Structure formats: C-alpha cells, structure tokens
Design a protein around this ligand. Sequence first.
Ligand SMILES: *[C@@H]1O[C@H](CO)[C@@H](O)[C@H](O)[C@H]1NC(C)=O
Ligand SMILES: *[C@@H]1O[C@H](CO)[C@@H](O)[C@H](O)[C@H]1NC(C)=O
Ligand SMILES: *[C@@H]1O[C@H](CO)[C@@H](O)[C@H](O)[C@H]1NC(C)=O
Ligand SMILES: *[C@@H]1O[C@H](CO)[C@@H](O)[C@H](O)[C@H]1NC(C)=O
Ligand SMILES: *[C@@H]1O[C@H](CO)[C@@H](O)[C@H](O)[C@H]1NC(C)=O
Ligand SMILES: *[C@@H]1O[C@H](CO)[C@@H](O)[C@H](O)[C@H]1NC(C)=O
Ligand SMILES: *[C@@H]1O[C@H](CO)[C@@H](O)[C@H](O)[C@H]1NC(C)=O
Ligand SMILES: *[C@@H]1O[C@H](CO)[C@@H](O)[C@H](O)[C@H]1NC(C)=O
Lengths: 232, 232, 232, 232, 232, 232, 232, 232
Amino acid sequence: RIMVQFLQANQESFGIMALASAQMYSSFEFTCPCLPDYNYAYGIGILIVPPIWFFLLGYVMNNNISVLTEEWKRPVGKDPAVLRYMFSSMTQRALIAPAVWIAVTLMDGKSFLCAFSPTADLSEFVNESYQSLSQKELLKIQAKIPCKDIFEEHEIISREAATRYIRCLSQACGWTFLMVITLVAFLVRAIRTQAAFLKTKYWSHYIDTERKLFDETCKEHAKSFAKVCIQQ
Amino acid sequence: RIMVQFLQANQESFGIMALASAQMYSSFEFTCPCLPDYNYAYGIGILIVPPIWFFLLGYVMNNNISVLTEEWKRPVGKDPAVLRYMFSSMTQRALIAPAVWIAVTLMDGKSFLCAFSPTADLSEFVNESYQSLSQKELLKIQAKIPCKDIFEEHEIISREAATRYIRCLSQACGWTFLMVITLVAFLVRAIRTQAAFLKTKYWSHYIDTERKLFDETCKEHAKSFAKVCIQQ
Amino acid sequence: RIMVQFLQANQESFGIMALASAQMYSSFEFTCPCLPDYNYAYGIGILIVPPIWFFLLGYVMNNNISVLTEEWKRPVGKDPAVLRYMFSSMTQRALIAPAVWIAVTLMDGKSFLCAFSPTADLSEFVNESYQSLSQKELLKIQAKIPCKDIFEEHEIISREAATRYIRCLSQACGWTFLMVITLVAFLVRAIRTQAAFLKTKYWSHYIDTERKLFDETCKEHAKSFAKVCIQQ
Amino acid sequence: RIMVQFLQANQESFGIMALASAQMYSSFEFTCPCLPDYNYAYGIGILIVPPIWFFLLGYVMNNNISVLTEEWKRPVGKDPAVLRYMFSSMTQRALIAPAVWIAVTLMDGKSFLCAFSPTADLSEFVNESYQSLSQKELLKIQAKIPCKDIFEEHEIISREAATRYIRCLSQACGWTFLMVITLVAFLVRAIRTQAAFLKTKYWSHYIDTERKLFDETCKEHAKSFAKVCIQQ
Amino acid sequence: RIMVQFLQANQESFGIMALASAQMYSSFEFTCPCLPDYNYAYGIGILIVPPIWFFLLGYVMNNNISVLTEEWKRPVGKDPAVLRYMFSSMTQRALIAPAVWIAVTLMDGKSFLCAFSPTADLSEFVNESYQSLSQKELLKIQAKIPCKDIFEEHEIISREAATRYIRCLSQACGWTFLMVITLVAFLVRAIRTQAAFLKTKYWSHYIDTERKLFDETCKEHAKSFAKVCIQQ
Amino acid sequence: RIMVQFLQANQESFGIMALASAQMYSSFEFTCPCLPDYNYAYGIGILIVPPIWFFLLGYVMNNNISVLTEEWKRPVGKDPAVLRYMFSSMTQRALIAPAVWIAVTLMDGKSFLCAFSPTADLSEFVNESYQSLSQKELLKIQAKIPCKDIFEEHEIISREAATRYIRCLSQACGWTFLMVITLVAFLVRAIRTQAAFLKTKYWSHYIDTERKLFDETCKEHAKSFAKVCIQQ
Amino acid sequence: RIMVQFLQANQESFGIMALASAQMYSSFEFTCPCLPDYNYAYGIGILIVPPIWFFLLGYVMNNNISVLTEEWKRPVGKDPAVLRYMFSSMTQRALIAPAVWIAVTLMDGKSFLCAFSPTADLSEFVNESYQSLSQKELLKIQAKIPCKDIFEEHEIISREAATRYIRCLSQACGWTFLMVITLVAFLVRAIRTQAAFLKTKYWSHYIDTERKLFDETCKEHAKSFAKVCIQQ
Amino acid sequence: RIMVQFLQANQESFGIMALASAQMYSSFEFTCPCLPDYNYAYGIGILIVPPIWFFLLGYVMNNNISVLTEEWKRPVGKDPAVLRYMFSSMTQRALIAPAVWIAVTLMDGKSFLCAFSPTADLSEFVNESYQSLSQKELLKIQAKIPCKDIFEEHEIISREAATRYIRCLSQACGWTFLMVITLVAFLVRAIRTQAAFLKTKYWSHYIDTERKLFDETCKEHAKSFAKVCIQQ
Ligand SMILES: *[C@@H]1O[C@H](CO)[C@@H](O)[C@H](O)[C@H]1NC(C)=O
Ligand SMILES: *[C@@H]1O[C@H](CO)[C@@H](O)[C@H](O)[C@H]1NC(C)=O
Ligand SMILES: *[C@@H]1O[C@H](CO)[C@@H](O)[C@H](O)[C@H]1NC(C)=O
Ligand SMILES: *[C@@H]1O[C@H](CO)[C@@H](O)[C@H](O)[C@H]1NC(C)=O
Ligand SMILES: *[C@@H]1O[C@H](CO)[C@@H](O)[C@H](O)[C@H]1NC(C)=O
Ligand SMILES: *[C@@H]1O[C@H](CO)[C@@H](O)[C@H](O)[C@H]1NC(C)=O
Ligand SMILES: *[C@@H]1O[C@H](CO)[C@@H](O)[C@H](O)[C@H]1NC(C)=O
Ligand SMILES: *[C@@H]1O[C@H](CO)[C@@H](O)[C@H](O)[C@H]1NC(C)=O
C-alpha cells in the first residue's frame, strides 16, 4: 500500500518514464515460484530484464533515432560531433527508467527475498531442535520462506524474523545503489561540449520550422485546386 | 485489483486502443471451464481470438480504408507508392492493441494456467501418498486447479504451489514476448520511404481543405435561397 | 462489479446509445424465474426484445424521420436517391445499440444460463449416486441452477461446475458474434454512393441556414411592433 | 442499489422531469402494508397516483398555461389553430414523466409484488404438506410475502421462489409497456401542422423581444429621475 | 439514507428555501418521547411549528417588507394596487418551504407514527393471548412502538407489522396533500392583475438604478476631496 | 453524524460566522463530567460562555471599531447620528453567531441533558423495586445518565427512556427560542433611520477612495526616486 | 477525528500559520510516557515549547527582520518611529500561531491529562476497598491513567470517570484562556500611531517599485550585449 | 496514518524537496531487523544516510553547479565574490530537505526505538520475577521490542510501556533539534553581502535574455532556408 501511496503522491506533485516504471512495479504481481531451482532465476530476472526492456523502450520512443542511424550508416554524413552529443543525450535520457526500477525493487525487498532465501545462511533463526539436519532439507524450507500461504513449517524457522533480516539487507543495498548513482550524476553534471549544443539547438529549430512551413505551403497549394474543383 | 489500479494510473497519465484493450481485459470475466477437454481450447482462444478481433476493429476504425480498396480495385488508379505506405501505416497503427492484449493476458497468467494445467508435469507437487495413480485420474484433478471453488482435493495436489509455478512460467513468457516486440520495433524505427510521406501529407491536407471549402460554399449557396424563400 | 467498472471506464474515456445500452444492462435486475416452463422464455426474451426496443428507439430519436415518411408518402416527392441513402444511414446509426446489448448480455452469460439450463445435457456434473433418475425430476433441479438462494440440491449436481461450463459456452458465442459483426462492418466500410452524400450534405446545410435566418427575421420583424406597443 | 447506480449514470450522461421522477422513485421508501385488505390498494395507488401528480405538475410548470386559459376563456380570442398546437405540445411534453415513473416502477417489481401477492395462484410454491387448507388462511400468508422481516412461515411457502416469479411477470409487463409506448411515439413522430408551428415560433420571439425592450425602456426612463433626485 | 440521497440528487440537479427545509429535515434528530402523554404533542408539534417558522423566516428574508409596512402605516401612501400585488407575491414565495417540509415529513412517516401510535386501533397486531386487557395497559406499550431500543414487548404486539401500517397511512396522507396542493397551484396559475405587474417591475428597476447612481456619485464626490487631502 | 451532514450541506449551499459556530460545535468534544456537583455548571457554561466569546469575537473582527472608540473618546467628534447607526449595525451583525450556537446546542440536547439530569424528576423511569430510596443516592445515578460508558445501573433507571424525554424537552426549548428570535427579527426589519444610512455609505466610499488614491500617489512618488537611484 | 474534521472544515472555508499549527497538532502523535517522573515534564513541554518554536518561526518567516536588525545595529539609522511600529506589527502577526496551538491543545485535554494525572486528588473515583493505601502506590496507578493499553487496574480507579473530570477541567481552562485573549485583542484594537503607518506604507511601496525597476533595467541592459554576442 | 494525513494537508496548503522528503518517509517501509547486532546500525543508518543523499541530490538538481565548477577550475575566472555567494545560496537551498527528513524521523520515534532498544536501561519495565538475569539474555529480548509480530516475551518486559518511554525521548530530541535549527536560521537571517546579490541578479537576467534571443535568432535564420528548400 505504501508503493501505491507514493505513486499517488508523485502523480499529485507532477522525465515521465520514471512514473511509468514506478506504476508498472506497483501494479505488477510479483509471484516468487518458491522452489529451490527457480527462486534465484526468477528474482534475478525480475531485477535485471525489466530495466533492460525499459532501456530499449526509452531508445525506441526517442524521436530522432532515425537521423542517428542514417548518419551512422552513411560514409560521409551531411557535422562529426553533434552525433556523439545527440547519442549521449539520448542515452542519458533513456537511463532514467531502469535506475528508478532498480531502486524501487531494491527498497521493496521482494526480489532479494525471493532470490537469496534458499542459499542464505539463516542459522540464528533455525529452531534449536532441528539445528542438525541436511542442508538439502533446509533448501526447500528456506525456498518456501517468501510465500506466506505455502510456508507451513513454523516449527523449524521463524518466517518473519528472516524476512526482516533479508529485507533490511535489501534496503541497505538499495541505499548504497542510490548513493553511488547520485555521486556519478554529480560528477557528470560537474564535468560535462559547447559547439555541439548550439548546433543541435539550431538543427532542432530548423527541423521544426521546416515542418511547419511545409504544412502551411501544402494547405495554400491545396486551396487553389479546391476552389477549382468545388465549383464544378 | 492490480490491473484496475494500473488502468486508473494509465488513465491519469493520459494510441487510444491500447487503453481500450487494457480496460476490456480488466473488466472481462475470465471463467476457466475447469474440464479436461475444454481447458486448452478456452485458454488458447482467450489468448488468440481477442487480438484478432482487435486487429480487425483497428482496421475498420481507420478513416481511409475506403480509398485503399478503391485504388486496389481500379486497374489504373488516379501514384503507385503512397498506397503501400498508407497500408503499412494503417497496419502498424492497428497492430498495437493486439500486442497490448497479449502482453497483459500473459503477465496475468490466467489463460496460461487454464490452458496448460491439465497436461503439465506437476510431479513435485503431487502428494507422496498418491504418487502412483493413472494419469487419467490426474487429468480431472489438474484441470480443476485454476478453480478455487471447485478444487476440493487438497490431499493430492497443493493448489497454490502449482499456481505460482505456472504463473511464473507465464510471466517469463510475457517478458520474452515484450523483449522481442521491443527489439523488432527498434529495428523498424531504425531502418524504415521519403517521397511517399510527403505525398500522403499533401493528399491529407488537400482532402481536409476540400471538405472545409465544400461546407463553406454549400452554406453560401444556401443563404441566398433562404433569404428568397423566408420573405414569402 | 466488472460491468459497472467498464461502464465507468467508458464514461471516463468518453454513438451515445452504446453507453446507454451498457448502462441499462449494468443497472437492470436480471431475475431468472427458475422454473422449467418460463426459464427459456425469459432468457430468450431478455436476449431478443431489448435490442428490438433499442432499434425502434434509435429510429424515433432520429430528427429526420418525418421527411422520410413525407417523401415516401407522396406520389412525386420534391431527388429519388438521397432518400435511400438517408434511410440506410439512419438504419446503420440505429443498429449500434442492439449489437452492443447483445454482445454485453452474451459476454455475461446470465441469459444463456437462464435459458439453456433446464434442457442442457449435464451428465458429467450429476452425482454418481443419482445417475439413474427420470429427466422430469432433473428438469426442476437443472432449472433451479441459475438461482443461488433457491438451488438447495448440492448432493445431485455441482452448481458452480455447470455454471462455469454454460458461461464459457456463452462467452464463446459472444466472441463469435463479435467477430462476425466486425467482418460484416469491414466489408460494408470497404464496399459502400457519391452524389447522394453531397446532396444530403447540401440539404442539411440548407435546412440549418433556413432555420437560423427564420429566427433572425422573426426577431427583426418583432422588434418594430415591440417599440411601437411599449411606448403606449 | 441498481436504481441509484443508473441514477448516477443518467446524471453523468446529462426533458429534466424524467430524471426528477427517476430520483424520486429511487429515494421513495416503498413500504408494502403486508395486509390482505390494503395490499392491492397500496400497490395500485403507488402505480397510478404518482404519475397523475407528475402530469399535473408538468402542466403547472409550463410557462404559457395562462395564455391558454385566457384564450379558451374569451369568446373571440385575439388565431384559432396555434392554441390547439400549443396545447398538444404542452401535453406531449408533460406526458414524459408519468411514463418514466410507470416504466421504472414496473421494471422494479415492488408495486406488482405488493399488489398481486395475496390473490395470485401460487400452487407450485406452497409446500406439499399444507397443500389442502382454506384459501382464507393462505390470504394472510401470501400477503406477508413482500415483507422480509414479517414473513415467518417458510414451512408453507418459499418466499424467494414466488418473489422471482412475480418479479419476472412484472418485468415482462414493463417491457410490453415500453414497446407499446415506443411504437406509439414512432407513429406520432411519423405522422404529425405547418403554419401553426411558424406562428408559435413568431409569437414566442415577439414575447421575448417585447419583455427585453420593456426592461430596457424602464431602465432608461428611470435613469433620468434618478439623476434628478440624487443631486438633491 | 434515502432522504440524504435525494438531498444530494437535488443538490446535483440544482426557490432555495425548499432545499433548506429538505436539508434541515434530513439533518434533524427526530426523537419521539415514547410516552403516552407527550407522543401526540411532540408529533403534531414537529408537523406544525417548523413550517410556521419557515413561513416567518421567508417573510423576514424578503428584501421589501420594509416598504410594505411603510405604505401600510401611512394614511396616504406615495399607488393603491401594487401593494396588494407585492404582498401576494411575497406570501406565495414564502409559502413554498412550509409545504415542502410538510410533504417530506409526511412521506417519511415518523411524525405520524409518533403521534398516532398510542391511540390508534391496532387489534389485528396484538397477540391472541393478551387480546383481553385494559387499554390503559395498551397505552404505554403502543406508545413505545416508534422506539426500537425501548419497545421490549414483542410478545404482545408485532412492532414492524404496525409500523408498516401506520407508515402506509402516512404516505397516503402525504400523496393526498401533494395532489391537493398541485390542484390549487394549477387553479392559481390558470386564473391569476396586469397594470400592477408593470408598475412593480418599473419601481424595482428604478430602485436599482437609483442605488447604482448614488454609489457612483458618492465615489465621484469623494475623489475630489481625496486628491485634495492626500497632497497635504 | 447529522450535524456534520448539515455542515457539509451548508458548505455546499454556500454571514460567515454562522458556519464558523456550526463547525466549531460539530467539532467540539462535549464531555459531560457526570458528577452531581459539576454537571449543571458544565452544561450551563457550554450553553452560555461560547456565545459570549462569539459576540466579543464578532465585535473584534469588525474593521471600524477603531473609529467608533475614537469618536466616543473625543469631546466633540468631527456627525452625532452615524455613530449610533454604525454601532447598531455592528451589534446586529455580531449577534448572529451566538444565536446560531444556542440554537444548534439546544436542538442537539447534549448540554440540556448534562445540566438537568441530576435534579430532574424522573419517577416514571425509576424501576419499581428501588422506588423508595434517598434522593441523595439518586443524585449520582441520575448524574451518570449522559455517560454511556459510565452508567452501569440499568436495574434502577432506563437510560434511553430518560434520555429521549430530556432531549425532547431540549428540542421544544430550541424551537421556542427560534420562534421568538424570528418574531423579534421580523419586528426589527419591519420597524427600523434614513440620513444616517446615506452618511455612512458616503463615508465608507470616501475612505475606500482615499486609501486607493494614497496607494497610487505613493507608487508615483516612489517611481521617480527609484529611477534616480537605480541608475547609479 | 473531530480535530481532523475541523481541519478539513477550516481548509474548505479558506494568517496561514494558524492552519499550520492546527494541522501540526492534528497530525502529531501525542504519547504520554505514563511514568510518575516524566508525565508532568512531557505534558508541560508539549504545552509550552511548541508555541515558543512557532513564535520563533513566525519571526523568521518575516521578510523584513533584516532591515529591523540593520537599523537597531546602526548608531544613527537612515526615522525613529517606524521601527517600533514595524516591530510591534511583526510581533502581533507572529503571536497568532502560539495562541492557536495553546487553545487547541487545551480544548483537547490530552496534555492536561498527561501532566496533572499523577498528582491530582482523585478520591471520589478510587474504589472503596483500596481507599486506604500509600499515595506512593497511587502515584504509578494514576500516572498510568492516560494510557488505555497500559492501565490494567480497573479494580482501583475508574479510568473514564477521572478522564472526563480532568478533560472537563482542561476545557474550562481553555475557554478561560480564549476569553482573556479575546478581551485583550479587543482592548488593543480599540486603543492602538498615525504617521508611522503612512511612513511604513510608503517605504514598502518604494521598496517594491525599486525592485521591479531594477529587474526591468537589468533586462534592458542585458538585451544589448545579448544582441552583440549572439551575432558572433 | 498521521504522517499521510499531514502529507495530504501539506499538499492541500501548497522549497519542494521538503514535501519530497516527507512523502518518501511516509511511503518508506521501515523494517527494524530486530537483532542485537544490526539494530543500532540500521537505526543510525536510516537516520543519517538519507539526509546525505538528499543533500547530494539537492546539489545535483541545481541548474548552475556547472558554472561553479567551471569558475573554480579556472586560474583566473571571467568576479571573485559572486561565486562564494552563489555557493552559499546553493548550500542553503540544499540543506532544507535533510533537516525535514531528520525532524520527521525523530518526531516519529521509529529509528530511535530500533537503534537504542537493545542497550538502553529498561529496569522499571522488566518484570519483578526475572529481575536477576544476564544482560546477554536481555539483549535479544530488548532488541525484539520494536517488532510487534516477533516480541513474544510479554512475561519479562511490557512492550508498550518501554515503547512509549523511548518514543517520548525521541520526540524530546526532535523538538530540541527543531529549536536549535530555528535559532540558527534566525541568526543567519538577522546577520547575513550587497554587491554580490545585485551581480548575481544581473547575471541571471543576462543568461535568460541571451538564451531567449538565441532561440529567436535561430528560428529567424532557419525560416529563410526553410522557404528556400520547401519550394523545390
Ligand atoms: C522448536 O521445536 C520444538 C520441538 O522440536 C517446539 O516445541 C518449539 O516450539 C520450537 N520453537 C521454535 C521457535 O520453532
Ligand atoms: C498426503 O496424504 C496423506 C494421506 O494419504 C495426508 O495425511 C497428508 O496430509 C497429505 N499431504 C499433502 C501435502 O497432501
Ligand atoms: C453423491 O451422493 C452421495 C450420497 O448419495 C453423497 O455422499 C456425496 O457427497 C455426493 N457427491 C456429490 C459430488 O454430489
Ligand atoms: C414442508 O413441510 C414439512 C412438514 O410439514 C417440512 O418438514 C418441510 O421442510 C417443508 N418443506 C418446504 C419446502 O416447505
Ligand atoms: C403470543 O403469546 C404466546 C404466549 O402468551 C407466545 O408463545 C407467542 O409467541 C406470542 N405470539 C406473538 C405473535 O406475539
Ligand atoms: C427492576 O428490578 C428488579 C429487581 O429489583 C429486576 O429484576 C428488574 O429487571 C428491574 N427492571 C427494570 C426495568 O429496571
Ligand atoms: C472494588 O473492589 C472490590 C474488591 O476489592 C471489587 O469487587 C469491586 O468490583 C471494585 N469496584 C470498583 C468500582 O472498582
Ligand atoms: C511476571 O512473572 C510472573 C511469573 O514469573 C507472571 O505471573 C506475571 O504475570 C509477570 N508479570 C509481568 C508484568 O510481566
């Protein structure tokens, strides 16, 4: 409920793909398979592949990827640097949604709990009676931890006690990730290109004005033949 | 509830047929027949035929299919190319809603669960007591899995344990589909036609201006006889 | 609740009679009589007569049925064609609400369940104990199926198991109907009349301009006598 | 709850007296007396007298009933025809709310259930044990049917089974009424008066312009004496 | 809850005192004293005195009662007729809220139930065992009827059975009152004064224009001395 | 809940201090001390001192009390009459909120119940067993009546039966108060001063115009030195 | 819930710091320590230090404290009086929020209950059995009174009976405080400085005009060099 | 719920990073690990590192950090003081969100409770029976205090009694922090730079005007070649 609450708060306070990723996470039915073989795969996949898809999507939604591939494809493109600058700007704009997804899914330690439960060392939580049993038997039990309606072995492991531990580890990792990302962003904004920016601004203005003028002249050239044919 | 939540979030953030398909799924009463003979048929049908209907509908709602069939029907149409371009644009605009429907119904593994439950290999979930019994007897039991109010054989198969497994497989398939679709869209937007676009823009502007001029001249030609007849 | 949800979604997204029929269905208290003699009649009636009433209503709400009957009544009407075109347009606009009603009431298999329950062949659901009894005794029991608060014979037939079966059949029929209707609409929009359209547009513009001019000249002719009489 | 839902839907979609009657029904506490002597009277009264009051009210709210009675009262009124046309238009506008009330109260078979329960033939619902008893004893029991908190004789008659039967009959009668009304409206709009309409339009415009001119000239004639007296 | 629902519906659809009286009733804590001596007094008082207060209030809120008493007080007032017309108009505008209050409190048979319960003849509801006991003992019991939390003698009288009876009588009286009021309003609007209306319109326009001119000339006469004193 | 409901209704329908007092009452935690010594004091205090504070507050919020005390303080004030008129107008505007508070707190008989419970004569409610006991013992019991969670002596006095009685008395007193206040307001508006009103209107317009002119001339006199100093 | 209700009512009716303090109180988790040593300290602290912080905050948020300290710091400031007037106005504007906080926290007798419970004389509430025991033992019990989930000694002291008593005392103190504050405000507004007000108004207008002129001239002086450098 | 309530109140009343930090806290799932080794670390981390990240973020979001690092990097920057002033202004604007976070997380004593529970001296709460046991055994029990669903040793320590104590200490620390911060802010606003402010204002206006002029001249220079190329 906290995720939906912050979603509504972000909507009220309200570049846009961030809210898209947040909403998609808050409305995605995370279901851990709760099996010793697919737990790790499912957790790491939910952690890894959605940001990759968001990266690709952010590249696709960009309106000027066509000019980029056109210039990269030609031997001598009609300058040499606005291309690198435009590509860097596109990549930087696209990298936002994956980072938001990773941060959200780490602060909410569901993927971490699903992925690292079967193999983690939970020895302070395992009951004192069954403190000597094969780790192969512990594998299934620990894998069933992230499932409330499946874990029916409270006599061996306290579920909430290990859930809180793993979730705290996940939140620590999330805050570390956020700090590193913010430091990198600070360095980037403090270091980084002057002529390329002006050239790109000019080319964008030129494209817009050309499109508008083309629409206008098409309308004017159509009005004449319209008056000609209608009078028939 | 997550589907309706993301529906409301999409409505708040808000080409339109995507929201139409999402809403239609979130408000469609999926009822698995829970029978070994019609489970597969019903699941695959819900997966397959609604996107076909959405494709046809998107073709019908298009305002310029009439000109397409008129030109395809004539021996020598009044150019050759803008037709192929217009048809490709129509098809690309129409293909959006089916993809959204398939993605949604795969992320929510209801159709997958209904379709693949009776024949899947659920051997780690079947109880150890009835681990040796005819697969024909297992057919009905496994078919009854997606039905909460019908599956009354908890002593043979854990329902939730297999539900999570099949739903995880469905979500994996959904993410794979999304990745492939995004890659194809990236390639299409990066590869693909210059004169046809301008010709289509000009023809659209001409049609609009002609319609507006016709309305205007009809009003002007009517005003005279109106003043003539009213004075009687 | 799904019907009301999609009603609200359609209202938010928002020719109008479609929403009218959807709302009327979502707010109509469908009560199956649950009797072997009136079940079929009630179900088929709810399926058939409301779309007929919607058809008639859509014909009545049309603002230019009077001109149609005036021209059809005269021996020589003041052209021949715009009449057929206007009538076809009226019929096509009117046929929308009945189709929406039928589609909605088929996707929600209440009418189908009420109509086909007493006579359908439910042999896989009838308990194995009373698997040999007179179909006349089965008539009342099966007729009582669509009534939750009346069906008190769970020892003979599983209610939900047959409800899901009949509802799935109804949804299949609904999707078939939708596909056929969409194909017919595609063919109609792709095949079908050029002069009649322009003539109808001109006549509509003429009628509107004449009405407006009549209002204006009435006001002007009234102002004089108003100034005359007020000064008394 | 369905009536209030459709009330809100009609409000959202939104001549006005229709919504007034619908709201008044949805907010009127229908209380069947549940007595063999007053059941019929109360049901038929709720069915009959509210539409009569709505008819009278619609006549009263009409702004030009005074001119109608003034002309009907004079020996030679200052034309002959616009009176009949104005009266017919008033009656047609007024007849809307009673029809809406009757349709609503028939689709919701409360009045029908209250009125026809004590005397209807409910022989398939009366228990097999007391299948031979004086109809005078059955009178009170059947009269108590529409009262949930009063009918405490479930061992003699199944309440819901007869409630559904009578409600289905009421809904059939309601749909029949709607069909007949729609057919009559279609015939009226298709048959029916040309000069009277123009005369009424002109007289209405004249009245409006005269009122506006009178207000203006009153203000102008007052301004002079205002400037005269204020300066004192 | 029905009263508040219709209150909200009236607010949504939305001379104003009608809504005021409706709201005041829907938010007034009607508490029957449930005593054989004060029941009648309290019921009749709630029925009678609030409309009297509403009448007085509607007279007070009227902006031109001062001119009425000024002219009625003078021996020779500065015409004779517009006074009677203005007074009749004031009374007619004021009489709306009391009628609405009476209609509402009669349709909701609380006052009727509180007032007429102790003395009404409820012989078909009194149990057959205590069918022979002093009416003085029946007085207290019947008086306690409108109180749910006080009436603890279900073995002598069925509370709901008599509540429905008295409430039905109250609703009948309410509909009769509404019909009579509507008939009287129809007769009044059909019968009833020509010069007085114009004179009142002119006097109102004159008063308004004089007030506006006085404000304007006060501002103009103040501006001069303002410019004079500010410069000091 | 009725008080908050009417608060919301008044807010929707919406001199302002009336709503302020209503809101303050609906959001004030009335806690009867339920002791034989402080009950009367607390009830009468809640009845008396909040209207006094509202009176004082309404006097303070008035924007022209300073001119009143300035003129009352001087031996010869710069006319004699507009002072009495302004003071009367201020007092009349201020007297609204106390009356609203008293009316509200009387219609909701909480203060009356808290104040008059310990000493009232409740002899028809005291049980027949303890009908002969010292009034000093009855004092505490009756004082505990307005407290639901404290009154634990149901065997001696029926709590609700006396609560309804006292609340009915309170509502009677409230309606009497409202009637008397409305009669007094009618007499005041019908009796009551002509030159003083015009003088006050003129002085108010003069004050407003002087303030506006002073602001304007301050801005103009500042602009010059602004242009002078900025250029440095 | 009453505090939040009045918060919403104040928001709907809606110098601003008053609502800030009200909201901060309604959303502050008051937790009495329920210990004989820290109860008094915590209660008095919640009563005393938040208004001090609000006073300081209101001083800080004031936009012209800098000019005040600048003039107070100089030996001969560039007049003598507007400083005292500006300081008095600042203090009066700042004193609003602390008074609102104190009034709110006194009307809601939580701080009073927490502070005065351990040492108050509650002898009419202590049970008759333990009416002779060391006050040191009574200290802990009485201190635990404001805690619902901690006070588990109902056999010695009735919790609600003393809670109501102390809360009534707190409300009395709150009303006394409000009356005294209103009287002081009345005296202040009736007594209190003519030239200082005009001087402050003029200085404020001058500051505003100077700021606006400076922005304008900065823009104009920048435009020239902008046109100069851009053309390079 | 109080935090979300004040969040909504702040949103309604509504430099922006304050609301961001408040929302992020109200929607952050604080999960104390409830272990004697990681409790302190987790609590202090939640207290310390989020404000550091907010500080860095506020530095990054600042639009003119690039000019700061450009001037700090050059040997002789194109003045010497607007840099120090701009840096101080940036730091002061950035320091807001960390302070809000610390204040919020201290008023809501969750971090304090998680951090200081295992080592605090809770001797008045430990039961009298186990008042002599190794502090190593008390370590785990006290560490489990902030966990409602884990602390299952009510026979040794009263959970709520110590929770209230530690939360009161946390609130005291929070109010102390707020007072110190407000005093420092008062001193800063009262002490602190005249030429630097004007220079920064001028440079900002110059930058804005230059950007706008550059956009304009780019559009004008593009229009010519647009008209040139379109005509081809
Ligand atoms: C540990 O196991 C014993 C029996 O083996 C059981 O009684 C006890 O409740 C268990 N405790 C926990 C914490 O699992
Ligand atoms: C397996 O079956 C046995 C009896 O056959 C039953 O006692 C046990 O609960 C079952 N377990 C599961 C997981 O189905
Ligand atoms: C079938 O009938 C038997 C007795 O005739 C009963 O025990 C059993 O529960 C019934 N089963 C079903 C599925 O109706
Ligand atoms: C019919 O009456 C018998 C006894 O007379 C009773 O046992 C049975 O439940 C009743 N059945 C119905 C349907 O009323
Ligand atoms: C009538 O009274 C008898 C005993 O006097 C009791 O058993 C019965 O339930 C009562 N019935 C009603 C309807 O009050
Ligand atoms: C009156 O008191 C008797 C015993 O003294 C008790 O049984 C009875 O219930 C009481 N009745 C009321 C109405 O208090
Ligand atoms: C007073 O104490 C006695 C026993 O000491 C107990 O029975 C009684 O309920 C108590 N009463 C109150 C009001 O505490
Ligand atoms: C203290 O411990 C005793 C037994 O050791 C137990 O009976 C009692 O309830 C405990 N009390 C508290 C307050 O923990």
